[model samples]
Target: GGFGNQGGFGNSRGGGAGLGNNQGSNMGGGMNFGAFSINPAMMAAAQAALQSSWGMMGMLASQQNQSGPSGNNQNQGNMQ
Candidate 1:
């Protein structure tokens, strides 16, 4: 009972495929953003970068606690 054999087709949107049934099917769960490919490795690296405390980007993120406020007294005037 295939589609073509049972064709009384009229104004049908038709069968299609594109990214198909992916979830829970080990499709790598990646996405295409135009020419860009977003995969798990990229996602992990991005998350790590956001969490790192070494520079300007770290400073911009206040929740990471990397750049503490000036003279908040974790160091009581001692350069340790």
Candidate 2:
């Protein structure tokens, strides 16, 4: 529900912010660039991105967990 070309997003942190309420780079403010209020589509996209990130994180965590415990057990076995 907003710009879709040439640097569409106003700011990375506030994808669904209004044109009169999005400012500042790292901290954010009240000076937006989008026309209409961010809608469900934009929200969905954000949600998807977050979920994808979480999925990747979960995969990494699982791998680390498996390797960490297994490596410890292997070391114990070697000592025995």
Candidate 3:
């Protein structure tokens, strides 16, 4: 048979060498950050300083909220 049809070659894309075939098939990916070995030494002292700083930061925040205008109540008393 075999008249003259090149369709046989188009049937299989890869022959012996393999054009787009990944035999060493492997897939991988990921992420992360931050200090490890000596990060805590700084944190040890940092925590002490942060503890003090947080108190002052928190104190001013608390005082400002409580500093609400008591002038409303005072004005009523003055009128009476």
| Number of residue pairs clashing in candidate 3, backbone atoms closer than 3 angstroms, sequence gap of 3 or more or interchain | 0
lDDT of 3 by residue, 1-80 (tens): 78533343335563442234333333222222334345332111111111112223344355423233333322223221
- In angstroms, how far off is 75's CA in candidate 1? 32
TM-score of each: 0.14, 0.12, 0.11
The root-mean-square deviation over C-alpha atoms between each candidate and the true structure, in angstroms, is 20.5, 19.5, 30.6
Q: Is candidate 1 or candidate 3 better by TM-score?
A: 1
The TM-score of predicted model 2 comes to: 0.12
lDDT of 2 by residue, 1-80 (tens): 67522355555675653344333223222233345556422211111111111123344355423222222222223221
TM-score of 3: 0.11
Which segments of candidate 1 are over 4 A away from where they belong?
2-18, 22-24, 29-42, 45-80
**Which residue pairs does candidate 1 place in steric collision?**
none
Report, for all candidates in order, the number of backbone clashes. Answer: 0, 5, 0
Q: Can you rank all candidates by lDDT, best first?
A: 1, 2, 3
lDDT of 1 by residue, 31-57 (tens): 333334454232211111122322234
Candidate 1 lDDT (Cα, whole model)? Answer: 0.34
In terms of lDDT, the poorest run of 10 residues in model 3 is 43-52
In candidate 1, residue 18 scores what lDDT?
46
